[PDB]
Amino acid sequence: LTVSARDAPTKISTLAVKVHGGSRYATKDGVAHLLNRFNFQNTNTRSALKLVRESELLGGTFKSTLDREYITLKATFLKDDLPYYVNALADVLYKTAFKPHELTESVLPAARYDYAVAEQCPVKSAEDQLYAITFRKGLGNPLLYDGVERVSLQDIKDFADKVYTKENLEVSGENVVEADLKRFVDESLLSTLPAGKSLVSKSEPKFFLGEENRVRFIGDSVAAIGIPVNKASLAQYEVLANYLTSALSELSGLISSAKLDKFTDGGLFTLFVRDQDSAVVSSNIKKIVADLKKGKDLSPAINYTKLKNAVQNESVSSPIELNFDAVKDFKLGKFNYVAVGDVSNLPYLDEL
């Protein structure tokens, strides 16, 4: 129950409850996706229809987002409607109904739609293959439920009992008085959640290097590399991720995408080359790693990196605050590799 708020002279407020309950902490494969798709169904006192109708008549919307580390419950609204949305989020966390007819009618088809639209992108396929071969049963758990191991409703209730605790959540408001928000998150049902324990680890997530995975796919072909990053080398890989997709590099005509996912205890640098034929993406990824194995100076891209990091941490005000000033050179060491698509024409890891 960390409660932080950032005031503004502005019409629209937003309010996010972030719990550490994402796919990192999934006891079964995809129980976090089903809890996320379950989030704003009906509670004991208010139906899910009544919440949507009353919030529309009051002027706001709810959303629930799932990433690897978090489950986020966001509410965007007009500024002086704050305690309604606080009590709505508190009721969603405290007392959700967990009915089998809501599992089988509205939650499971929504999750099936989510997985069916994430399968069609070979970049997300390669990204989760990358996560799975770098970290195995920590962050390598799958993001979305695909029914490979069957998740019953009692599993969803048990996962919600595990992660919806008082020590595992953060209340984060934007354009809202902090004294009013702090008065409204006690005087509530957030202050009678179980004071469990916070599931975040302070250790290192036990990475793996030199791994390779190839999956066939009809459509675009994607060759991807991935490098696990510890905590102290985070700024260097962020300057690399902004250098490789900018005009300073010779390689962004070849690199389709490149980013760095940052967590509390490290991160993963991902690079994706994508095209519709395999000769182009093969020669491209060979050129990328052949000229990343020779060094690159990244000190041109430091100010550009400070700019992009400012514009992408303007949104959330719990960022990581890297330094960026002590980064000079990069040389590619060992890395994990994923082929997706026409895998018998994409290169292997020992050919890179």
Q: Which of 46, 136, 183, 306 binds a copy of itself (CB under 8 A)?
A: 136
Q: What residue 300 binds from other proteins, a copy of itself, none (CB within 5 to 8 A, per partner kind)?
A: other proteins
CA angle 103, 24, 271 (to 5 degrees): 115
In the range 209-228, which residues lie near a copy of itself by CB under 8 A? Answer: 213-218
Least distance CB 147 / a copy of itself (angstroms): 6
Least distance CB 262 / other proteins (angstroms): 18
Q: Tally Cβ neighbours within 10 Å of residue 183.
A: 15
The answer to whether 183 and 171 have CB atoms below 8 angstroms apart is no
- Binding of a copy of itself at residue 348 (CB under 8 A)? yes
- Residue 182 is given by DSSP the state H
Q: What residue 136 binds from a copy of itself, other proteins, none (CB within 5 to 8 A, per partner kind)?
A: a copy of itself
Q: Which of 2, 10, 152, 230 binds other proteins (CB under 8 A)?
A: 10
The residue whose two tokens read 């994402």 is 22
- Binding of other proteins at residue 183 (CB under 8 A)? no
Give the integer Cα–Cα distance in Å for 320 and 334: 25
Q: Residues 187-206: x/- map of binding to other proteins (CB under 8 A)?
A: --------------------
Least distance CB 347 / other proteins (angstroms): 26
Q: Give the distance, in angstroms, between the CA of residue 233 and the centroid of all CA atoms in the same chain.
A: 20
Give the integer Cα–Cα distance in Å for 273 and 347: 12
Least distance CB 132 / a copy of itself (angstroms): 8
In the range 310-339, which residues lie near other proteins by CB under 8 A? Answer: 310-311, 313-315
CA angle 187, 189, 194 (to 5 degrees): 125
In a 10 Å sphere around its CB, with 0-12 CB exposed, 13-18 middle and 19+ buried, how is residue 185 labelled?
buried
Give the integer Cα–Cα distance in Å for 79 and 175: 7
- In terms of DSSP H, where are the helices of 120-163? 122-134, 153-163
Q: Which of 27, 44, 58, 204 binds other proteins (CB under 8 A)?
A: 58
Give the integer Cα–Cα distance in Å for 251 and 351: 19
Instruction: Give per-residue burial for 49-61: e unless 16+ CB within 10 Å, then b.
Output: eebeeebeeeebe
Q: What residue 12 binds from other proteins, a copy of itself, none (CB within 5 to 8 A, per partner kind)?
A: other proteins
How do 212-216 and 336-341 pair as beta strands? parallel
Q: Which of 59, 147, 295, 319 binds a copy of itself (CB under 8 A)?
A: 147
Least distance CB 245 / other proteins (angstroms): 10
Q: Which residue lies nearer to other proteins by CB, 66 or 107? A: 107
On the CB side of 203, how many CA atoms lie within 13 Å of its CA? 6
The residues binding other proteins (CB under 8 A) are 8, 10-12, 37, 40-41, 47-50, 52-53, 56-62, 76-78, 100-101, 106-107, 109-110, 113, 246-248, 252-253, 300-301, 303-304, 306-308, 310-311, 313-315
Query: Which stretches of the chain bind a copy of itself, using CB under 8 A?
Result: 29, 132, 136-137, 141-142, 146-149, 213-218, 278, 341-345, 348
